Design a protein around this ligand. Sequence first.
Ligand SMILES: [Zn+2]
Length: 46
Amino acid sequence: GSSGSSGSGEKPYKCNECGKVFTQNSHLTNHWRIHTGEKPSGPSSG
Ligand SMILES: [Zn+2]
């Protein structure tokens, strides 16, 4: 079978706005920037 459970494997830091994953904190917090404005009105990139 296949186990699809996150937590241990994935990193403790994960963007709760799109679904990204980073190794450090400063990286995650920073990323959010792109989410907070910056021409958020357009074609979804995903
Ligand atoms: Zn994000």
